[PDB]
RNA sequence: GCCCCUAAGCGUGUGCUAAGUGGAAAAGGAUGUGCAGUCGCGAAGACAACCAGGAGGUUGGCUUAGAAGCAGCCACCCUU
RNA sequence: CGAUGUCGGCUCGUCGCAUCCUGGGGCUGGAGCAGGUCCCAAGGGUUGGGCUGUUCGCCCAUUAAAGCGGCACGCGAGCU
């Protein structure tokens, strides 16, 4: 889990959602895996 | 399943065949004592085989015509292609040499007409380098 | 594709169904490219093998009075009309259906009429 | 929305009934309830059927359809056919079974570790590594199938542990 | 070649000034003024949307027809004031044409094709002017760029006109340049 | 790394962030162009930054213009000094920049790519900035 | 600077119309 | 300024906000939402999902240990 | 400026978390042991000596660890 003020779609399996107000990024590669903070 | 490109005239090589026929369980002296046969009865070019395989091991060889790509390097004359396909020219090949090699692709191919085959092996001539003519 | 695109292709199927005595629909599910060739080298030296859209293929229909197959083509549709005779097509496709066992002889076209698979067998058993 | 647009059709052997907001479908499985949001009407289709309605357009309303019209077929589904779920074991050493109606596992711990069976849920084990949760709730299958596939770390190395039926994990290699 | 004039309707301005000209803006209007040969200049307020897309759609250089409380006038747009910010259009200069005058306008050149792998393509002057008769402006002028070697310039005299249209500027104005592609190494030394 | 041959005045007054720019407001010799939205002075330190990340993501063909010089000097005091005793000494050039002035220019034959470099360029900036092209 | 930051905040009110004595 | 402290409106009409934003802040990140405007495709059936395919030539050549549609360069074609 | 005692040490604390230990996790170029990095977390704990006025630092033995800071660089009507 990454957590910057910038996440975006590294690779073209990433998937940008909302959850709980907060924008995250995921993926099924876990290294893609990170969140807005 | 696999498929190869291998010299004629020896067998049991060390880059391409060996590994891919071990892990298939083909065996390796029978499927080379036979091809090395076959390609001494041609004794023309290098020929490719694909590999078929059954439960029982059993292995059964295919084997087509020789690579378009040396049947139009030996009539070119040059041994290596050109490495600027396009932008310099190595060597040049008439219309016979070509529908000899046109003939050869109908007999190995799914092409209903000679003229098919014609204008595959000047595609083949194009990404080579190779005028037609 | 385009709407030009569509209809230069409902003019070419309207005038190869007017070359054609008859034609035949069938079934390619399950067919590979390496099978569609084979059946190309043994039918185009004589029939013509062709696939379409079968909204396409309705819209060429409505030039003669050929509109009574568009029940027919529910699912895939595989067209093969007769340029030369009008059964070896019919022999062909049946031969080539009981081969793959993928091809389901969905109908064919003979005299005007539109007939069952049934009729069709006994048509090529004439 | 086309979710929602979609009536669920309602099998003979299940009995519906409608009160208001809160609906019921009893069936050959057993009684399960549900409550709807306010928003969305709920009635019963004349033809044997369901039909979910949204008298407005905006973002909830048009978000509620879809899953109000998938929770009700999901009901559905589970009084007429039941829900059940396969897992397998993998790894040497690793088994389960029934020590009656709880679960039983040998996942390399100091200690067993037992899984117990909350109401109307059923375990089934056929192979000391295979078997299978199976229960009328969707909710609740998925749930203790969770909890049931979380008893060990992920493991990309050997792949220890408990999977699902067609699951494949991730692996990768270490060389030392 | 002929060109059918856009219609638009236009309203004489009651109220000129900076104030009133901010208003009309802001009422999606667009201010303009008319002269020509008459020797009259007429003040306008213009709607910005569809004259905007008669810009958009027949270039900088438009063929207009102006209802002036139901008479007809042909204009053409002489100059067009953008603010260079906001990209919107605040003054537009109409002249006063009739059939069979000849005007002088800037009309933008662009390239098509494609050269040589090893070349890069340069445009040194993104528009020129032509003599044309005022209802005949073509509405660009297209220079092809297609088997050009290394270094070759293409100048105003080279470029290919439609009949009755005259080039004015002189012919050695360089309006495309077509250069070697610059090597890697050439990026690194420009601009230090 | 940009700096005059000669200057007539080594110290001067600050250049004013005033108003839009008037001149230099539309792209000219290449395809795109970064266009300023702000007004900020922009430093040789920060062109040259700019230039190499265009150039580093465009690699071998293209041809990029700076259409910014610094040639305003901008002058710094020696560091734990008092106020007064003169001016400091002249050690940063920069150029006054107001929104609508044409920065950079970019001559590329694809959009993707051309737009990328220039995107790399203007995070180096230190102001906000829009990519404009030749068309209306 | 919190403080400092509050105050020429606190310059914005409606009461004083965005000006206050030490801004 | 007008819910109560605290004098006077839990005023009227039409919309917006879900953040207690209102009741502090930057570069930048982002399928939040409302409005207005352009362009693409679409009942001759668009997009998503699904099923069946997605070949042969040929492993196109240079190049290496290797080159097989995918270290690297080139052109980059033919049949069904 | 008709006086707001100033560096270290002692005694006594109290608060922040930008966490040193213990506690909970995500990704690893994480096999295991042990780590690296990031997120959560302030409940308690956080040694004794050699040299130097020293803060600091270096060193010697340990320890789970030998945290970083604010409070007139906390604390002289409490001491030196
Ligand atoms: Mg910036
Ligand atoms: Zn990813």
Redesign the pocket.
Known sequence: ???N?????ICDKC????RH?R?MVICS???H?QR?? | L?????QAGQANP????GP?LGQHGVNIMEFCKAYNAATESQRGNVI?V?ITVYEDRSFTFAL???????LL?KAAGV?????????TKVAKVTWDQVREIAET?KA?????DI???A??????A????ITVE | ???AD??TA?ADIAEQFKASTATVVTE???????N??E???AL?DSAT?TVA????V??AASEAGIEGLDELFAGPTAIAFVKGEAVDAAKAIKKFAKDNK?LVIKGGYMDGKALSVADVEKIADL | SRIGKQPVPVPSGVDVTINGQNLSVKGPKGTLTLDVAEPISVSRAEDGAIVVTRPDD??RSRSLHGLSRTLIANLVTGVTEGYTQKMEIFGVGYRVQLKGQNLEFALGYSHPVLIEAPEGITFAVESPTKFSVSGIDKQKVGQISAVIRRLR??????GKGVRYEGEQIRR?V??? | TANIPNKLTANVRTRTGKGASRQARRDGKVPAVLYGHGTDPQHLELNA?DFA?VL?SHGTNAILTLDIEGTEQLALTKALDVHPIRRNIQHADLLVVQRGEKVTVEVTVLVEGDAT?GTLVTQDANTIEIEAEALSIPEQLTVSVEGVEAGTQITAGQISLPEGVNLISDPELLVVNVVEAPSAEALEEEGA | MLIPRKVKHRKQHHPEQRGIASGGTSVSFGDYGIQALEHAYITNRQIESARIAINRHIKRGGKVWINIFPDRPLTKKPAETRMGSGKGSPEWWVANVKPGRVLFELSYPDEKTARDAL?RA??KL????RIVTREE | A?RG?KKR?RKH???NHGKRPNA
């Not at chain 1, 998937?15 to 909302?18: D, L, P, Q, T």
């Not at chain 4, 770390?153 to 050997?158: E, F, G, I, L």
Request: net charge positive; charged share 35%.
């Open positions: 889990m990454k957590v003020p910038s996440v975006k779609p998937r940008v959602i909302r107000g924008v590669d876990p290294r895996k807005q903070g | 696999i498929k190869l490109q291998i060390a880059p391409p065949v891919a490719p694909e087509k015509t020789p690579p378009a790509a040396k390097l041994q290596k292609g050109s490495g600027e396909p396009h932008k692709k190995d191919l799914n092409a209903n003229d098919a085959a204008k595959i092996i000047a595609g083949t194009r990404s080579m380098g | 594709m385009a709407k569509k209809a409902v390619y599910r399950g067919l590979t490219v390496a569609l060739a059946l190309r080298r185009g093998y859209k079968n909204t396409l309705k819209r993928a | 905006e973002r770390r992920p493991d990309p190395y050997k990768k270490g060389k030392t | 949307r897309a958009r792998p | 995107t203007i995070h230190p102001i906000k900035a | 919190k930051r905040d009110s409606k009461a």
